Design a protein around this ligand. Structure first.
Ligand SMILES: O=c1c(O[C@@H]2O[C@H](CO)[C@@H](O)[C@H](O)[C@H]2O)c(-c2ccc(O)c(O)c2)oc2cc(O)cc(O)c12
Ligand SMILES: O=c1ccn([C@@H]2O[C@H](COP(=O)(O)OP(=O)(O)O)[C@@H](O)[C@H]2O)c(=O)[nH]1
Length: 454
């Protein structure tokens, strides 16, 4: 029997897009989807609704919070430092969520971040489902019960080792463990420390789910089910669905001018701005390779245009071999273009999936975020599908030479490390795209959802 599922993702394109990819897959199986989205953002999402008779968008008015820029709805609209104010705004949609649930009466609601929701759904006889599109390895590492019980006694040294029972081994750098130790405590919406918020969600929800498959995410989902004692489901890897919009002719034309697999595509998602010095090092490092390149970057902190921030003489030198562009582009369609030989990625979970299912060599440039870093270690050290750019142990900065080196290694047909990561990427791609992998993930996913509402 088909389920009625409401979708309430965090106000970020990296959550809205995979929630919508999964919504399409569920609607293909006959499930009805009530998709809650920020009002103005809906227009940018219609692109991905492949089943409009089963997936209905319901607009939310993102309420004012002092300090929130006017009209902002998504982390793509605000600086990263304003994230916590946008969380307060999510929290403030509770009254219009409460009334949406009372009239739509879904059986289940998928959600991010809003730990006040499972109390409302329990009142309404709705099952609450905390659905993560970040890596379960990340939540396991930072937000499992052993971490939370040390409360404010958790130090950087504590975060250099995994919590008790963690299924896997990888190494963080000092500046990374410092980042996790401090940001953990910072308020993220309505006065709630960041890790406490996610821990409240994990503790109060009826069930948990993650993007992923047993073959990769399995050990972390098993750890989390053991720790929190409730079902932790896998949706499958949320393979991107095809958009209703073809590749912009202007990019298709320009990309088509380059030899197959010769171009380096670099993008760091839609939420982040580099500091100027690392903006310069990254671009000079791309230039040093001599390969054509497309870099999708916001102007660095303090700057409003790409032009103003470019290293001196850069435009005149790179000529028509390189473009630095700050607008939103069709990343999934660009990564499929045969010109792209290399993807320099900030290791956002969505970008990771989009690179893995394509042929591009992966260069890992994780930005300062627990999920990006943990994704980069898993991809670089466990799956060994990419080469990570070296950062300073204490300062977290990279040189132009380290960018150049990583791209040169993966692009060199005769380099054994490049051949190794190509071979391992092929293995992972063949797994993720296996004819029965995503479908059997979704088979199990939907049976366990049926169990949840039983
Ligand atoms: O990145 C994390 C994360 O998602 C992101 O939180 C950033 C803010 O810090 C946002 O700006 C990005 O839009 C969001 O994708 C989340 C998160 C995502 C969805 C949830 O429903 C949830 O409860 C936690 O948790 C983390 C926990 C960590 O210990 C370390 C992390 O890096 C994250
Ligand atoms: O200019 C852009 C930037 C991002 N994306 C898409 O936005 C999502 C970004 O998710 P990810 O988790 O990689 O990074 P974030 O932007 O949240 O840091 C992915 O589906 C990308 O393909 C896009 O289409 N165009």
């Amino acid at each position: 029997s088909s389920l009625h599922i409401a979708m309430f993702p965090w106000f970020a394109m990296g959550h809205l897009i995979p929630y919508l990819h999964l919504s399409n897959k569920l609607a293909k199986r006959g499930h009805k989807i009530s998709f809650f989205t920020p009002k103005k953002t809906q227009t940018k999402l219609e692109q991905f609704n492949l089943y409009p008779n089963l997936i209905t968008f319901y607009p939310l008015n993102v309420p004012h919070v002092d300090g929130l820029p006017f009209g902002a709805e998504t982390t793509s609209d605000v600086a990263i430092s304003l994230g916590p104010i946008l969380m307060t705004a999510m929290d403030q949609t509770q009254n219009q969520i409460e009334l949406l649930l009372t009239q739509l009466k879904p059986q289940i609601i998928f959600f991010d971040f809003v730990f006040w929701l499972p109390k409302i759904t329990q009142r309404l006889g709705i099952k609450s489902f905390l659905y993560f599109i970040i890596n379960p390895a990340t939540i396991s590492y930072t937000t499992s019960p052993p971490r939370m019980f040390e409360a404010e006694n958790l130090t950087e040294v504590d975060l250099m080792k995994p919590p008790k029972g963690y299924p896997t081994s990888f190494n963080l750098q000092s500046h990374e463990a410092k980042h996790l130790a401090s940001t953990r405590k910072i308020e993220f919406g309505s006065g709630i420390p960041f890790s406490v918020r996610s821990y409240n969600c994990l503790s109060l929800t009826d069930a948990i789910g993650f993007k992923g498959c047993r073959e990769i995410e399995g050990p972390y989902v098993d750890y989390l089910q053991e720790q929190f004692g409730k079902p932790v489901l896998l949706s499958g890897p949320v393979l991107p669905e095809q958009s209703k919009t073809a590749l912009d002719e202007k990019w298709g034309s320009w990309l088509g001018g380059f030899k197959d697999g010769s171009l380096v595509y670099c993008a760091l998602g839609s939420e982040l701005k580099l500091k100027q010095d690392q903006f310069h090092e990254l671009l000079l490092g791309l230039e040093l390779t001599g390969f054509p390149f497309l870099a999708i970057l916001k102007p660095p902190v303090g700057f409003e245009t790409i032009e103003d921030a470019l290293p001196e003489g850069f435009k005149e030198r790179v000529k028509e071999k390189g473009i630095v562009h700050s607008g939103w582009i069709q990343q999934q369609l660009i990564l499929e273009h045969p010109s792209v030989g290399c993807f320099v990625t900030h290791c956002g979970a969505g970008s990771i999936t989009e690179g893995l299912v394509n042929n591009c060599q992966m260069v890992l440039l994780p930005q300062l975020n627990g999920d990006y870093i943990i994704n980069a270690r898993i991809m670089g050290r466990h799956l060994k599908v990419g080469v990570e750019v070296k950062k300073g142990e204490e300062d977290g900065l990279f040189t132009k030479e380290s960018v150049y080196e990583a791209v040169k290694i993966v692009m060199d047909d005769e380099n054994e490390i490049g051949r190794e990561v190509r071979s391992n990427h092929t293995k992972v791609r063949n797994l993720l795209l296996r004819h029965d992998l995503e479908s059997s993930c979704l088979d199990t996913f939907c049976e366990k959802l049926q169990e949840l509402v039983s």
